[PDB]
Subunit: 262 residues, 4 copies
Amino acid sequence: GSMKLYDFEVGLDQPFFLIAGTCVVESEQMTIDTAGRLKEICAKLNVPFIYKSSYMDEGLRILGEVKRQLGLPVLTDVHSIDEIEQVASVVDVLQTPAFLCRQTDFIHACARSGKPVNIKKGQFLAPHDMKNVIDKAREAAREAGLSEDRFMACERGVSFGYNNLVSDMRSLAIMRETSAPVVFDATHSVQLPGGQREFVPVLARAAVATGVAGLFMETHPNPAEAKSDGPNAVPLNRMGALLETLVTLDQAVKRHPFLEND
Amino acid sequence: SMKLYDFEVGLDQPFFLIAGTCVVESEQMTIDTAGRLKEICAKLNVPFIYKSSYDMDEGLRILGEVKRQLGLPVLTDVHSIDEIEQVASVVDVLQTPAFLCRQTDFIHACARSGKPVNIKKGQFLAPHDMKNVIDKAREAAREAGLSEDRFMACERGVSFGYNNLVSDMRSLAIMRETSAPVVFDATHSVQLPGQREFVPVLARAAVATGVAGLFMETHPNPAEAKSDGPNAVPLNRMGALLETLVTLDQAVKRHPFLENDF
Amino acid sequence: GSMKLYDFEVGLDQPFFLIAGTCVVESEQMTIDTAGRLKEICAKLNVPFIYKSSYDKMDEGLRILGEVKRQLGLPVLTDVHSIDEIEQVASVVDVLQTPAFLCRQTDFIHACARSGKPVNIKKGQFLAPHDMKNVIDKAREAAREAGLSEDRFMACERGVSFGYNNLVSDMRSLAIMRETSAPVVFDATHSVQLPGGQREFVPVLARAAVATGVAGLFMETHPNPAEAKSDGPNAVPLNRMGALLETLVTLDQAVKRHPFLEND
Amino acid sequence: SMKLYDFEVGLDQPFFLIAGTCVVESEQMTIDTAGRLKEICAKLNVPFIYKSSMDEGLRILGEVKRQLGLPVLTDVHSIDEIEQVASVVDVLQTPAFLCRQTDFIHACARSGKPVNIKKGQFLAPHDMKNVIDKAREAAREAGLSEDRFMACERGVSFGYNNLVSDMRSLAIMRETSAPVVFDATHSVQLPGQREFVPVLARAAVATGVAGLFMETHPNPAEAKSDGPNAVPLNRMGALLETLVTLDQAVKRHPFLEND
């Protein structure tokens, strides 16, 4: 399942794309500044790039400005059914909170919004459960007269005892049965339910070698203020270096079929 | 940056492979399969340690023939203090069952054996718990007049509910604090306390995370290697898998790991 | 921690109350019969009883619940799944109950909190026990903001994720959630769930939970035990409810006769 | 069901208590504390096995056994200790991590003494049947009776640095046809939790078990909430009175789950 997203193609058989945004809220002008830096970093490496909003009316307006000034596709989380219409009018991709993955009214209202949807897998789900979630979203899309190839399955961690998430790299393989692009959320997969930014690169490298369609990471736009006890965000001035590694990994594992298929 | 016979191993070296079979074969076939593995690894310049399929006196004789005929370093599991002399008198590297990782009498008998030891992390340990295991093992070696840089720390999964292990890639980075080479066991990490499909998945993830070494079992009879069989890569696919893994390992070791700078 | 719940008071210092409903939908007439049978089973043992709707997984379901109330006088609880359902179920039901996975969906929980009805708030299987305090405190602020009293919430244990497709019931949670200052309810039916087939553990966990010390207990019952197999819903056969409840009464009395030692 | 020292133990019997101290005492105060536990348990008719808090430890355990006429239990840690330990004690106990180390479990099996086999924190409850079935094969091949083993729940790993007590395990392990023992002190321990010992004890006894292990703190003056996972000695009577009431309640009639 390799689908169209904005003006590029995404999927397990395509070069990985990045979703990134900031771990702090900036002024309008600085939000554009940071988005522009990310655009340039990704452009030089040829990594397809979707900008994610740092946060409602005002947040959406600024996202609209990012889209218009920088020609970027943008993505935001939607939190309730009542928000969908307003958000989907502005953004190119909706993203659902993990804990709502089985709130069928909500997921289906997103599915019929007219925009593609990055569906986060609840931390209480087994990887096989995503197939049901995607199948029912597709049925909602069909019934609204919309194409079915408009969903991604997003791994964000599974509950591991109390106050911890583990990233089971097996999930990234299993969710290929959804026939939907698999997206790895590196920032939320390290979060204790900040202080874990050291594991963002670790998990990103592991996930990209596992084989995914896309990756989400938050970035810290003020490396001067970016500390190990802060958000689980990669400093902006190190993003280039990490992406170069991830491109090499992505190319390596997609040069030939994954053995586990073969 | 540990010396291990003919080569050096470590996070700062190319990864080494420990591999042996998921089935016991006749003596002649055992030598045959060890030979094939030696050549596969030779063509790719992957340092190779052979693991015994017998882990009794008969199995040690056959392992003796493997070493004499092929010159391979040999690794074996040992299960009790008595097996150490019986074995450490024939093999080059000892390996300890994960469930015995805090059985200090046994781990310290291995530490004083005169052979290097790959010490498996218990499925009930947290990654930070390995430092104390290695530190006490090094103490034992020192008290016996042996050098301290003779231990590896081996990740083999952590318990995840009932009848399931999960491979937390964070552990591979955390155990770097042991100043011991970290080894990833891909075959036992997938096991349900029928999962061969996850062996290449976890090997790629672990190699991209950054390890000193990797353990995988191989199936020597690919005509009879099935999905519901052992958690083993068919011998005829090992070369292709190792080529992927070499590419990933070289890629992540080209520069310092980003997480070091956090 | 005590709380008025219509005709009775509930709390760690009161006799436990039961929430029970069927695990299958029955005809209108068997629905009424079954509700009367449960009423009687509980009446004979003096177990305060709240009837749970079988129709909550519409207007018909609500009509029938209306007949249950009008005919039998039972207080009625229902799961609600969206903000819209709150107003829809208002004329019939007495107690709202929230899906576990919505425990942090603030718009939804605060709508429940403002409904005018008390609410049994299920703890998500992704939460740790200490997390429930903030959930309850948020619900109370919403209640306050709407001119409603704050002593109208209960905290319901329904298990926590344990690897894949498995829930474990950490009895420590039932003690820890006392810090919410709200009655703690144990859901013995969804706590055995394998995210049916686990009905053998419903009495096990109900006994354990009541001996741990709770305000309330939710169990489903099966009205047609002869159809009720080991592979079916996680429900106590209706003809065994009396015997189980007599055991649970005895446990509840034993553990509340004196202070809980963990409080010393 | 089976005979243990002087008495019958099992799901169809009044629960027995295994208890020992959370701190090593002097010989005389070890004796006094075992004495006080003995009296507490006798007043309530609770069958009581004392667990030791190597030569010297076994010497003192032998004095407890003899002077107070108590059965005694201790952990064995290697095959090499078995013969020395079994000549002194009435019940062997195996560390949970060793539950699959079959040469070691089977040596305990042939020892001639009964064995309380701890379920490792890495095992699923169904896994104990194979462990116990093999122990029994080892007993039989040695000419000993097969009804000399107990399955002991001590927690299962729950993420990192935490154990959870799945009360389902206590019912599932009934399939072993061996008495199930609940370890309330080790089931709370983080791989400062004494407040959960009474919680888990009440829960396990209501679930239905043959036996219960708890540590007690013999110096309640020094016994703190940040201290061991141990019930102060002066509160054991009150706790045991509650537990007996629960044990009688759930054993009065068959367990509903037995359908």
